[PDB]
RNA sequence: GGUGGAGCCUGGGAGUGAGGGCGCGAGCGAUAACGUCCGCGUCCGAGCGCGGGAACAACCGAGACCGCCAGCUAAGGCCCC
RNA sequence: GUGCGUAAUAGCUCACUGGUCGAGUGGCGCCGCGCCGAAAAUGAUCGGGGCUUAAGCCCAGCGCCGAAGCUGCGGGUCUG
RNA sequence: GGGCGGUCGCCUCCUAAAAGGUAACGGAGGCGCCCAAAGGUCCCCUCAGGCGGGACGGAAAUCCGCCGGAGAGCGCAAGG
RNA sequence: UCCCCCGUGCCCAUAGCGGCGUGGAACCACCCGUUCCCAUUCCGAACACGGAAGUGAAACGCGCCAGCGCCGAUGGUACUGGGCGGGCGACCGCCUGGGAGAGUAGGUCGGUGCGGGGG
């Protein structure tokens, strides 16, 4: 008659943390994500649980197409 | 058949069917023109004018177009037309759902079944000259165990038979015995 | 009474009853049916003491049709219990509808005997019910 | 060019932050209170949000 | 349906093309993400010689002077159908040094 | 665009950490509570200062610096108190 | 065979229809306002008196009353 | 309301209102570990099922061919 | 200044699936062997090597077929910021913008770069 279950993990606060169109340096996460959601593509690296992060710095672009997964894009400027 | 149209040009129309005149668009190939018809027109010819009848529609161009219904979207809480696809047939085999129908004894009177699956006796398409307007489906003897339709005893007269499928069709059910 | 025999989980929620049908509206089964207009639930009890009254009302023919089904635990919790200390215990599934949906339908009834099977299990039910026939108002092109 | 004037006939109280401090952009805070204003988009977009609010006439 | 795909990777941006058919071989060095094809190096379109594994030697010294003649330099190498055995196209001018 | 008791940084100084009502999105409850707990906003608290709702904090209007035997209006009314 | 009436009978009324009459007559599906359902404990009432082509209810229109709101004027304070 | 009962930390999904966060004695579950390989690099292969068969074979052991684009598997509950 | 084929790409099922053609002078594939460099929990099937007498059957490209699959328009609501009301409640109505998912018409069995071979 007591309660069965009534506890709940914190939150490990997830989520895209760098959008697109925003000047960066070398170094900030572009986006914190649980499973790789986005595929790394020109200077993004990924780290040991998926997150991805970019190698240089410069305006971040998204989606150069899919059909195999969405991607990350750091492009420079030049 | 014979019902009178008008014009729409991006309206309210919303506003417009509070007076019976309910919106609607009719197509061949192209020109999708927004038009409205009346409620009590449209409704006591749709009493009977059924999806097999072709409705034809006078215009103030003059023409007389040769529409059918596409779709009749139900107010749902109202039970009421919201807007009627119509559609214009040209020099073109068309698609058809024809209320076909049964007659004769069901299976044997006293122990008839109920016969309830009509599901508007899925596709037929058609030529203009060639297009029907009553079929007949009889049940001569279709008792409860055996003797069921497949249809496989569907060949129509005539144009077009089923394209696909042969497993839509009525069958025989037991009553509800105390 | 009827039940789900497997779920998921047991207990769910409640939530809302906004939404005009979401689908229900159009008969294709029978030639009449008995449609809702007021949003409430629909318990096990309330799908039997209407079942009944059709078949014990017309005999020896005419086949029922039933598009109910619950999948929502209705959930009460014992008598002279205080508040909190988890949810109530599981007594009856219930069945929400929407306004404009079509719940029961009869098969190879007339008109003067369907309307009457129609009318007397309109009043198991808490729902004003109104009756529709089969019309032109089908889904097809 | 046209010019824009709004009179200010409801207050916000009783009404959001994106009223209340959406007056403040235009920077009126009474009732029959009126201002001559540009005509940019802006403006405008202010305008039809706290249009429940003020009267709008073009000069 | 088979497919290894070693070309998915692409750290370091440039990258040798070969292609070995039944009969002879074939080599590109490709410029990633632009779709341009820089220099090329094809038996039976110069037609070295008739032996299919001794073209290595010569597609290499030739692709490799071609390649330092175009002025390309920091290049790399693929290998997606085809094993590292057989034929080597080994070279000891350009970036490559394998 | 936006000069506003707008913002940003440093330092000093308190108070608060029992909240509640209303509309919506919800959970528990019984689609019960002027019931419990969140979020989005407002109000009371701190505006029991004002007009209406007969009387009443959160329903509506309105944000009281003071004074005048001056007008125009918001909500609400125009048979008499 | 429409309802009675009979254990069953018999019988009374009929669904169906002939007239001397007489110019309108029934079933419906919506829709606005209504009636019953509606019985609790000190004295009853919508604030009260009263209100029926309204002093209620629906769509309108022109005015007016209506705050410590805004302007008319005077005076003080704070900021720039 | 307190006592009795249940819980006290971490993780997963929902509640949770499409950024993040977000409560209740709200619902459903796990953990106090394990791998010298169940690690790194390099090189090969694509799964689970269904159909047609077999020599035993449960309809599941092992083998062949076709369909099967990820419904298998990824040490452990759930999600990606 | 063009068609055919081979590599390598970008569009992310309008690119595939299934059926019907068609091609080897020219590449590519198939094939004949394993003798060495190489390999197989086993085997030259797949990697590797000599070839190349025979072939386009299979696979691979191009062309056709809309049903199989996919994409999918205008209206029309569902829904909803925001504002205004109704219902004792469950929940609804109007205006201003925005605007789906299904379904219907229809479309498709490809589009476009770079570097090579032959005419
Ligand atoms: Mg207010
Ligand atoms: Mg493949
Ligand atoms: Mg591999
Ligand atoms: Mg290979
Ligand atoms: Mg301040
Ligand atoms: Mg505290
Ligand atoms: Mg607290
Ligand atoms: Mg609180
Ligand atoms: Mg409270
Ligand atoms: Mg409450
Ligand atoms: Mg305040
Ligand atoms: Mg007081
Ligand atoms: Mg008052
Ligand atoms: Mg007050
Ligand atoms: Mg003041
Ligand atoms: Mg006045
Ligand atoms: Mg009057
Ligand atoms: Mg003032
Ligand atoms: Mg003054
Ligand atoms: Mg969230
Ligand atoms: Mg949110
Ligand atoms: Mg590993
Ligand atoms: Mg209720």
Redesign the interface.
Known sequence: ????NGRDSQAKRLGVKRYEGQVVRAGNILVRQRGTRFKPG?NVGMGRDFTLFALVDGVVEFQDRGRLGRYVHVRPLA | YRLKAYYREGEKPSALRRAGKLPGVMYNRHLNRKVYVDLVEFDKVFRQASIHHVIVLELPDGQSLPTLVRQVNLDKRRRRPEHVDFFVLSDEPVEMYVPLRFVGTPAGVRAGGVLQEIHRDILVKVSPRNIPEFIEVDVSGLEIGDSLHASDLKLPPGVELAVSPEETIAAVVPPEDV | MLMPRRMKYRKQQRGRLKGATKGGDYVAFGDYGLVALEPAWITAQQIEAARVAMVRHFRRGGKIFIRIFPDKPYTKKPLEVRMGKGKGNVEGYVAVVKPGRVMFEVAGVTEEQAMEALRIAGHKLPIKTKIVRRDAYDEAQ | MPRLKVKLVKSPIGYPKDQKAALKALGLRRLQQERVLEDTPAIRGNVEKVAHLVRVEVV | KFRVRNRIKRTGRLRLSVFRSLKHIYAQIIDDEKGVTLVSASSLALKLKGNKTEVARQVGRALAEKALALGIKQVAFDRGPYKYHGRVKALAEGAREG
């Open positions: 008659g007591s309660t069965r020109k």
